[PDB]
């Protein structure tokens, strides 16, 4: 409750950043009703630090703004918990400090973290990604730097397909696309046991690669409550995949299984791409909610933790640069990563091949994994043609060749034109005449 | 393909009795302009099969537009199981019944209010390994209705150096039973875990020699890495040595999640797994219209195997309304939830850990209401707010349960017990409202 001790409106934020020994947190907090804005901020600082009921260890409120409901806290770095084991930081501590008891405080109506800042000393203690989309680029025969677009999907129905049937759908998508994701719940269901399903998938992977001369990728759901179950799934898929183990990403449903889930896989399989699926993140990181944290904070936390890739959505871009760059600007804090690897944006839904380049231009690169719905593959020669067309669209974008010209020499791309006639004649008027098609 | 996922002719009594389906009850409201049954069928589609392979479809069996009630029946075959041991996993239960549906196009908020797990499935869960009975055993009480355990948290939350910390514990143990790490304490640099646990085990020996009684400690072993968790646990039990059975393993289950908890539950099945619920308000909150209820939260914890779980802190809401069915759901063998009666087949109880300002005067009324005193109390104001200090504070709570247990009027007991008599003068306001004119009785 005490202000005086935990409030130092007068602290230059730059001084704080300059002497990198404070984690900074920016929230949108609203005092209950009858309570004082700065009083309540002193109190929130209090409940997130030393409490009381020594002061070099206290959480100081350094900036307030009642109109905007903006509260900024400075957390000494000494508060964060570290491993007794290897001396590394933990995300669990960071959450606990900056978002535990403070999320159920009679006194506060709501409080949601919008951005956070970690200094070098602290930031350097985190695991960070061990691999990213470069690992995938190396499998696909692409350059390690600016490798481009990875074309993926989710096999549907989400649950229902038996083992042969699942394997088979994987094979057919593999004739035109690169990556396949297990949907969220696919695991060891009685009707489609994991051991069976995966051995068949493995074989669908060798069949597809042989028939196309191209490398294929699979993202296998290894989520469980028990870490040794997580590990037993991981080791099983890799061994089954065998010569193709480098082509397997390990999917962890991370929101519903938590940080240990993500940390098990990250530390046990540092050579395989850890695919962070955001399942049910939606109850916290949804604008309808005024509690917890935002998607930006969620995703920025994933880098530090070590996700190789994380579903980002489809600003979608501040997230993207923040995950990608060695220096990014977030809502309030700009951050340096001192060489910490990138964590690849994974986008969903999808547009057609015509729309594709709009996205590429906007983002400024095409260094993402597309997990597209079958709509993005809705194409007149089929979905094989459909996935090729997306690839052809990326390629023309990267060569800086005009779609229309690439299209005359690439059948599936030209056929996407006729597939979405009103999109074509809107985005590239000519087309009809122009393609003679 | 909507009306494939709806079947309002299904009778809830037949679903239960068939014992092949997981029933969920939500407060679901469609986005403006969309039909209730259609929206509900959407949600069932996208929570099971999807399509956007038909005998595994989730079915909407009952709906009530006016109360924003959606009840879905999920076949047990949908749920994932361990390839290592064939047991159930909460992660799958969450992914399916809640997860994916937490931002569903034509649905503006959905909150699960209750669930029913058939016998077949419920038996795949770990369930608690121990509960308050292992505490009782250690303390010397009867393993059946052994009563109230009085504890606290060491304040300040953070900042105490190893030695000072260990002496604060020592001091409390002179009057009470249990001491718990505050949620954030671990291995900060000012108070290394290894040093502080060495010194705390020591104050435990000390305090146990001087009182001639058994003392309890809950050590925070929460971490991101399982192996770090496992190492914290092994270090703490080892260090306590002879007193290893007196240690509860504290795991912040909300922020590290389900695998943290399962790590502690299976690596150390013999020690009481203290599930502190921190962060949880974000979703649990009455205020939030998404995720799930605290009742739901609590019920999940039993199945995962939490030994005890934090509840009813209250806050300053002195209406009333809900948060009652939680106590019985957590401890009975058969309990009634807001929608479903649940049978637990002999699966061990999970003990309520209550907090806050439970002073010795309100204690009796609390117990009369719950029907028993079988909980762990992590007192703050009840202890700390006594004119004689926390130790007298602690003794007065022990005293209050003793009066209650023996069916002795509090005033009578207060007359014979100094600490209880002085609780009255500590909380004057409490005494006016519950013990009309105690003044005379006690003599000023
Ligand atoms: Mg999905
Ligand atoms: Mg607390």
UniProtKB/Swiss-Prot annotation, chain B:
Keywords: Calvin cycle, Carbon dioxide fixation, Lyase, Magnesium, Metal-binding, Monooxygenase, Oxidoreductase, Photosynthesis. Binds 1 Mg(2+) ion per subunit. Coiled coil: none annotated. One of its GO terms (biological process) is reductive pentose-phosphate cycle. GO terms for molecular function: magnesium ion binding; monooxygenase activity; ribulose-bisphosphate carboxylase activity. Substrate binds at residues 100, 157, 277, 310, 355. The active site is at 155 (proton acceptor), 276 (proton acceptor). Mg(2+) binds at residues 180, 182-183. It holds the Pfam family RuBisCO_large. It catalyses: 2 (2R)-3-phosphoglycerate + 2 H(+) = D-ribulose 1,5-bisphosphate + CO2 + H2O; D-ribulose 1,5-bisphosphate + O2 = 2-phosphoglycolate + (2R)-3-phosphoglycerate + 2 H(+). Its cofactor is Mg(2+). Its EC number is 4.1.1.39. The basic functional RuBisCO is composed of a large chain homodimer in a 'head-to-tail' conformation. In contrast to form I RuBisCO, the form II RuBisCO are composed solely of large subunits. Homodimer. This is Ribulose bisphosphate carboxylase. The gene is cbbM.
